[PDB]
């Protein structure tokens, strides 16, 4: 196997970290650089290809795409960083008032019996003098910090998971003076940010998650055979992987009610498969359609971030046009996209006649 | 809310005996019924009817029915210095089909 992923141990945290934000220049406009979502599953699409030089040019190609459910992240914080000879140091974290109970669940291991007193005194310094402690801490970021980040969390009630604990993550602001991005961060407090605003269609993005765990296995499957370099048994899976150059094929709204409808098939249907996603449920929010395979199991939190470098391929500058999206049953050999055309194909059944 | 209460339940043993070794399904179904009445009535002292044991073992050791329908009766254990003050008695009931039947309380009067 590769010696680059040599410490084949379990990932230290379930969420998995970005480890590198894009290099920042002040001439760019102010923008965020990452987001979070939940893995729903995969489907099948047909894309009308426009690849000059390809054998499938101006033809129909069937591709596998991955659906990531993206409820709108809520911005709750702002973290400033300074440059050091020892590295990079966090100087000041500024939160907001009216923190939701979802992110408050994150700072507790037993929420059901706690007194829920987190950030109770922090809510009082917003009205202590006039907010002097809050404004002082922001001015400390403006005059001393070299780059600032945004604390945003996802909501689990919009997602069909039995979890109630939100996922809290730091997202870097790029493209501007430190004064400009701080005024973004304070203005963005208590506000939902959609995936329509962070990313866009036809864009390579970077996907970060923890892979599927397989427990203790031997050298037959852990290494792929017939000190560190010697193939030895141990843990396979639950490793942190950063994947590169995955195209955003679609960004659904969730309100639209015709998410799986294209300009060529005029069927008013959504992205959720007929019968539901297996072991996930229904996607009722914004979703991101990612081409190809993507790490992590279903229901797992997905971290999407911008590409670090300017792209060097025509695959990134390709406009994607979808002809149709599969919506048939994941639970078997489904030959029906919607409920309506199954009853149209089948005809009247016995239970339908007895009920009516 | 009463200590003495009799209710009738349906146990989906098909989902509780999925993938079990064939020669342990009838013994494990007895333990899953005991685990069922312990959770549903809060009583660790659970007694099963001998005719309920006949229904479980009706089709052999590997032929437990998918759905059994029983009555669980919480009664007061008087005894003399008993460890627990309540117990649940489980009996199989006679129905045409153990499907489509909701949980219901049976009135003694």
């Amino acid at each position: 196997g590769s010696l680059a992923f040599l410490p084949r141990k379990r990932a230290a945290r379930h969420r998995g970290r970005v480890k590198s934000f894009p290099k920042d220049d002040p001439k760019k406009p102010v923008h965020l650089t990452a987001a979070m979502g939940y893995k729903a599953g995969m489907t099948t699409i047909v894309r009308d290809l426009d690849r000059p030089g390809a054998k499938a040019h101006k033809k129909e190609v069937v591709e596998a795409v991955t659906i990531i459910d993206c409820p709108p992240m809520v911005v709750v914080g702002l973290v400033g960083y300074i440059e050091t000879p020892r590295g990079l140091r966090s100087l000041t974290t500024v939160w907001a008032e009216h923190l939701s109970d979802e992110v408050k669940r994150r700072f507790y291991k037993n929420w059901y019996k706690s007194k829920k007193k987190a950030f109770t005194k922090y809510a009082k310094k917003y009205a202590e003098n006039n907010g002097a402690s809050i404004t002082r801490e922001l001015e400390r970021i403006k005059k001393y910090c070299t780059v600032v980040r945004v604390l945003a969390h996802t909501q689990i009630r919009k997602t069909p998971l039995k979890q109630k604990k939100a996922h809290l993550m730091e997202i870097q602001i790029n493209g501007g003076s430190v004064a400009d991005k701080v005024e973004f961060g304070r203005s963005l407090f208590e506000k939902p940010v959609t995936i329509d605003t962070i990313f866009e269609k036809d864009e390579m993005i970077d996907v970060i998650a923890v892979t599927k765990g397989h427990g203790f296995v031997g050298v037959t499957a852990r290494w792929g055979t017939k000190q560190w370099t010697v193939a030895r048994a141990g843990q396979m899976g639950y490793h942190h992987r950063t994947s590169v150059n995955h195209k955003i094929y679609r960004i659904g709204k969730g309100d639209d009610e015709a998410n799986a409808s294209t300009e060529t098939d005029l069927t008013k249907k959504k992205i959720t498969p007929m019968g539901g996603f297996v072991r996930y449920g229904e996607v009722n929010n914004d979703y991101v359609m990612i081409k190809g395979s993507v790490p992590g199991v279903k229901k797992r939190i997905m971290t999407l971030r911008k590409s670090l470098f300017t792209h060097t391929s025509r695959k990134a500058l390709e406009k994607v046009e979808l002809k149709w999206i599969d919506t048939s049953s994941e639970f078997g050999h489904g030959a029906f996209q919607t409920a309506a055309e199954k009853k149209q194909f089948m005809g009247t059944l016995k239970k339908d006649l007895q009920t009516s | 809310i009463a200590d003495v209460v009799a209710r009738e339940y349906t146990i989906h043993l098909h989902k509780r005996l999925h993938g079990v070794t064939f020669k342990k399904r009838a013994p494990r179904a007895i333990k899953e019924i005991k685990k069922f009445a312990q959770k549903a009535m809060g009583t660790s002292d659970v007694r099963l009817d001998p005719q309920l044991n006949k229904k479980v073992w009706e089709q052999g050791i590997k032929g437990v029915p998918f759905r059994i329908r029983v009555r669980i009766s919480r009664r007061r254990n008087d005894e003399e210095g008993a460890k627990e003050k309540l117990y649940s008695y489980v009996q199989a009931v006679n129905v045409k089909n153990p499907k489509g039947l909701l949980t219901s309380v049976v009135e003694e009067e």
Binding site: A335, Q344, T348 | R47, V93
Partner: protein
């Protein structure tokens, strides 16, 4: 693209669904799933399998002749593109599909017409030799209602009410052994 139809059973074969077998004489067979393909390779006749649409057409379980099914067909002479024609085509298939469903439902009611009367005659025969298993009221209940008759004036209807109650109204095996 084109929604294909399965050779074996006739459900719609969408892209990337199933397999296609090409024979040496030039004929391609499109299948929707592995069940249809495996039954083809062991050379079973789909007109005999009751889940295939070839059997249902052969047995008369859906009708074949009427005007709306003649209106859909595979076209080998293309037409020039016309936006007015394509928009008015779409409104036609909305009308076409709902006319089919309202004629499918009439066809199913016509096949099930004899089922309704036959079931009541069979149940009429089944009651006439099983009188002893009917609801009958307990002797203690007829005793209670004997006293009540005198009190409120009356007996006959009283019983009919509590027998209607008994119909409007499950025993457990075994019982606890006293220690």
């Amino acid at each position: 693209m084109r929604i294909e139809n399965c050779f074996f059973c006739g459900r719609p074969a969408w892209p990337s669904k199933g397999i296609t077998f090409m024979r040496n004489d030039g004929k391609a067979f499109r299948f929707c799933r592995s069940k249809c393909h495996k039954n083809f390779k062991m050379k079973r006749n789909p007109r005999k399998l009751k889940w295939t649409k070839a059997y249902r057409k052969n047995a008369g379980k859906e009708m074949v002749v009427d005007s709306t099914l003649q209106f859909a067909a595979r076209r080998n002479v293309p037409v020039r593109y016309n936006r007015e024609l394509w928009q008015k085509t779409l409104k036609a298939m909305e009308r076409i599909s709902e006319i089919r469903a309202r004629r499918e439902r009439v066809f199913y009611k016509k096949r099930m017409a004899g089922k309704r009367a036959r079931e009541v005659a069979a149940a009429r025969k089944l009651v006439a030799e099983n009188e002893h298993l009917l609801p009958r009221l307990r002797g203690s209940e007829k005793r209670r209602l004997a006293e009540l008759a005198a009190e409120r004036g009356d007996v006959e209807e009283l019983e009919r009410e509590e027998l209607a109650k008994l119909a409007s109204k499950s025993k457990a095996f075994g019982g606890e052994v006293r220690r």
